[PDB]
């Protein structure tokens, strides 16, 4: 898909005999607004080159999510590193109640009512890791219902 969003641009440095060498890191998310989504990281010596590399990396390794009509299936709670993430479905009139990496990830993924919240560190890359770990494990019915028939598991 093609929906580009830029999350964070940071400037890092390494020390050499002579002084400091600077570089730029960029984090981006891509998706089609209907279930495909992925993130990418890039590094370069200029901001546009890093952004381009991040877009190219993010356009690969895109995954498919299972969403129940512009909203999640069930309340979920994921984590990565020291970051914890909580999301839960909301009514249609609700917006996206989230901040930073949450908002970009969920808006690009195609959901509109997510009402999320994060605990622990708010490092954007770890937050994105945690959010995709949570979203990639959305089961949806007819798959958790592989044990037996349908309309009895619910």
């Amino acid at each position: 898909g093609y929906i580009e969003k830029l999350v964070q641009v940071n400037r890092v440095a390494k020390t050499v005999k002579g002084g400091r060498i600077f570089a730029f890191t960029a984090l981006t998310v891509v998706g089609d607004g209907k279930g495909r989504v992925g993130f990418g990281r890039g590094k370069a010596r200029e901001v546009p080159a890093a952004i381009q590399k991040a877009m190219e990396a993010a356009r690969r390794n895109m995954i498919q999510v299972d969403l129940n009509g512009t909203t999640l299936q069930y309340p979920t709670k994921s984590a990565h590193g020291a970051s914890k993430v909580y999301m839960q479905p909301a009514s249609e009139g609700t917006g996206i109640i989230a901040g930073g990496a949450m908002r970009a990830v969920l808006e690009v993924a195609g959901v509109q009512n997510v009402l999320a919240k994060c605990y622990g560190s708010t490092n954007p890359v770890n937050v994105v890791y945690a959010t995709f770990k949570g979203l990639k494990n959305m089961q949806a019915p007819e798959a958790v219902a592989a044990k037996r028939g349908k309309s009895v598991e619910e």
Binding site: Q73, Y74, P75, P89, Q139, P141, V144, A146, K147, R148, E153, E154
Partner: protein
């Protein structure tokens, strides 16, 4: 010192499910038997058998379906240190109904869905999804 046998049962099931095993054997009791039966009716295990001879052994055969185990998150709720009880209106939902929570009521050990069907609350034993 095994002050909770049900937690031991669930821990055994989870540990040997993670280790890609096929059968779990444990000491049995008339509560673990009811829990095993209610899991069997929910398709979370293959079968369970109770041995004879004074010291019965309960054995359970697991399921895998795909490359990932069928039971991915099983957790005890009411422990001997807390003893949580809930009413009909307050029966917890796991994964918004996509899972099951085992409830012990005066009508026996059943699922939360059957608990509202009979309109009887009780003690929340564990949640499986």
């Amino acid at each position: 010192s095994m002050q909770d046998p049900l937690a031991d049962m669930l821990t055994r099931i989870r540990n040997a499910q993670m280790a890609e095993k096929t059968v779990v054997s444990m000491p049995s009791s008339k509560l673990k038997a009811a829990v095993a039966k209610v899991l069997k009716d929910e398709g979370y295990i293959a079968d369970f058998q109770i041995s004879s001879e004074v010291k019965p052994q309960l054995s359970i055969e697991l399921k895998y379906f795909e490359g990932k185990p069928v039971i991915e998150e099983v957790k005890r709720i009411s422990r001997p240190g807390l003893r949580q009880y809930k009413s009909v209106e307050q029966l917890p939902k796991v994964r918004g109904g996509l899972g099951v929570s085992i409830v012990s009521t005066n009508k026996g050990v059943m699922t939360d869905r059957a608990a509202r069907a009979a309109g009887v609350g009780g003690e929340v034993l564990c949640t499986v999804f």
